[PDB]
């Protein structure tokens, strides 16, 4: 849980910067290189974030604009996450690693900008939005956490492990 919008933004941005910082020294040519120890490539690691950040911002933007929201995505049910992730990877597969990092930087800024428009009540009380559902402990802030602060930390571990196994067992 978070104490405030301020702490939420701080935590997200710190984790973003540590994640992106790991990509320094990874060559564009290495973006699709897979090692058995890590389930994702460097390209997939960023494309995964792009996919979820845009999806979640989309839910909120669409709901407020009067576009009914289908979650998680129009052609993917919650039981089809595997396919959803592949659609993320496919959508960004053409971008260089450098281009991916620039898109991720702009997208994380969009994310913080969107959060800045939310009141503390919007963030931390349930049933303000329809898309967050009505379950206790799942207000906007939780959905935001599990799609930014949390995966930015998890996927930082992933890219660090990928880098390790470029050099050693």
Residue numbers in the entry: 16 to 184
Quoted from the paper:
The precursor PdDfsB is cleaved by subtilisin to yield biologically active Slf, and the chemical gradients of both proteins between two growing colonies could be accurately modelled. However, remarkably, the dfsB gene is widely distributed across Gram-positive and to some extent Gram-negative bacterial kingdoms (PFAM entry DUF1706). The most strongly conserved region of PdDfsB is the C-terminal helix, which is present within the mature Slf sequence.
A 12-kDa polypeptide was shown to be localised exclusively to this region and is derived from a precursor protein termed DfsB (PdDfsB). Also uniquely, the C-terminal helix of PdDfsB contains a conserved proline that introduces a kink in the helix. The processing site for subtilisin is highly solvent exposed and found within a flexible loop. Cleavage by subtilisin results in one of the central α-helices being removed, which would force the remaining polypeptide to collapse to a new state, or oligomerise, or bind other hydrophobic surfaces such as a lipid bilayer. The remaining sequence of Slf is shown in Fig. 1e, and it includes many conserved positive charges and aromatic residues. The pattern of conserved positive charge and aromatic positions is reminiscent of cationic antimicrobial peptides, which damage cell membranes.
